């Protein structure tokens, strides 16, 4: 609700493709396959 | 060279408390995926709990706390301790690292069986 | 959440004798299935990988086939150091629930 009005210097938008289930695997602090040889979120990602 | 051998248990009696270790050598633990996996004599596999790299421990519902993992560099070693072991538990134990999507658990380890029977 | 069950459950023939196994998931699985050989007793063994390739020491008897949910597995002539169970299960989404596993015995 309050990421309409926001301020942030940047905003990182990483895009790519990958399988469906995935997805909801890619969560701040959550580890898994791709959490450690391809793209790992920080511990704390405030982001979407 | 590459090897992996297994260390821990016995006939110890119900409620004690023991710890299995994993040596391997010619690999890296710190950057490996690795599972644990018990197999009932004469029965098929049955999995057990899974170790990341980075200090991520998962296992099943039903083992949520079994486990308290630990390591050792000076000879790339796992340490992996059980307080107060389970009856049906009797079992004989695998380490194991999958390389995951380009070929899976080809070779496995030694495998040490455990009874905690009263 | 994924179960993952084997069409067949206990299958049992002679030396020789075709093997059709089919390896279904409760939905599509890509990437994720090998076909192993535990055998009584002894350590457990992948043999086929991505069921297209032969690996080495494989006998080119055994075929793979399929591109998505259902992977099929045949073997020509059936031989005595195939006793074993097949495992295919789904290693992607924990917990890894277990399924039915394809005991082929010969007669």
């Known amino acids: 609700t309050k990421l309409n009005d926001l301020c942030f210097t940047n905003v990182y938008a990483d895009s790519f493709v990958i399988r469906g289930d995935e997805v909801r695997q890619i969560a701040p602090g959550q580890t898994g396959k791709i959490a450690d040889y391809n793209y790992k979120l920080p511990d704390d990602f405030t982001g979407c | 060279e590459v090897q992996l051998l297994e260390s821990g248990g016995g006939l110890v009696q119900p409620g004690g408390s023991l710890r299995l270790s994993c040596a391997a050598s010619?690999?890296?633990?710190?950057?490996?995926?690795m599972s644990w996996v018990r197999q009932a004599p004469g029965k098929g596999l049955e999995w057990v709990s899974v170790?990341?790299?980075?200090?991520?421990?998962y296992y099943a519902d039903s083992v949520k706390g079994r486990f308290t993992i630990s390591r050792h560099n000076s000879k790339n070693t796992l340490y992996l301790q059980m307080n107060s072991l389970r009856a049906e538990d009797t079992a004989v134990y695998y380490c194991?690292?999958?390389?995951?999507?380009?070929?899976?658990?080809?070779?496995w380890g030694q495998g040490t069986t455990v009874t905690v029977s009263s | 959440d994924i179960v993952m069950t084997q069409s067949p459950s206990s299958l049992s023939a002679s030396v020789g004798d075709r093997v059709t196994i089919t390896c279904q998931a409760s939905?599509?699985?890509?990437?994720?299935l090998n076909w192993y050989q535990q055998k009584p007793g002894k350590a457990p063994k992948l043999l086929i990988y991505?069921?297209?390739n032969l690996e080495t020491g494989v006998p080119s008897r055994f075929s793979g086939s399929g591109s998505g949910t259902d992977f099929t597995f045949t073997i020509s002539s059936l031989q005595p150091e195939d006793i074993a169970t097949y495992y295919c299960?789904?290693?992607?989404?924990?917990?890894?629930?277990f399924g039915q596993g394809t005991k082929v015995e010969i007669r």
């Open positions: 194991a690292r999958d390389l995951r999507e380009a070929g899976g658990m080809d070779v």
């Open positions: 010619g690999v890296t633990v710190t950057s490996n995926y």
């Open positions: 170790i990341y790299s980075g200090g991520s421990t």
């Open positions: 991505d069921a297209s």
């Open positions: 939905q599509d699985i890509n990437n994720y």
């Open positions: 299960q789904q290693f992607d989404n924990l917990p890894w629930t």
